[PDB]
Amino acid sequence: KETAAAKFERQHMDSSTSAASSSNYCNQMMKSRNLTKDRCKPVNTFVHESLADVQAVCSQKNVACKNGQTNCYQSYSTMSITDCRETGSSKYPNCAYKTTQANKHIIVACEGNPYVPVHFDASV
């Protein structure tokens, strides 16, 4: 049983690079994080910052989530992120992605004790 806090780190954290090293970054990471296991996840964001810096966003700017919920929080600083989206050719199990580098503010939904990120909502 994977906790929601643990699943967020598997799906979104990559503190090991300052940014996506190549255009094949997503194809490789989507596969290695088990995100293409039973279906090709259509969109996924990776964050290249320390976990402590990402966990601290839960104490920053409170904003509404895309689904109307109110437990979302936006980062005061921009963060290095990599946006992964399926290409027109992608077809399970042969999932394929486009890698795009960006530096944006991130919005995550927090929950629990301690209060941590459990869902990546969007970037602005």
What is the DSSP track for 31-80? HHTTTTSSS--SEEEEE-S-HHHHHGGGGSEEE--TTS-S-EEE-SS-EE
Burial class (CB in 10 A: 0-12, 13-18, 19+), 39: exposed
Q: How was this structure determined?
A: X-ray
Q: Which domains does the chain have, with CATH numbers?
A: 1-124 (3.10.130.10)
What distance in Å separates the CA atoms of residue 81 and residue 106, rounded to the nearest whole number? 9
The DSSP H or E segment spanning 86 is strand 79-86
Rg (CA), the chain: 14
117 is in an annotated binding site: no
Ligand-binding annotation for 104, yes or no, is no
The alpha carbon dihedral of 25, 116, 59, 109 has a sign of positive
Which positions are catalytic?
Answer: 12, 119
| Residue 1 in tokens | 């049983």
What distance in Å separates the CA atoms of residue 95 and residue 62, rounded to the nearest whole number?
35
What resolution (Å)? 1.9
Is 93 labeled as ligand-binding?
A: no
Strands 97-104 and 79-86: antiparallel
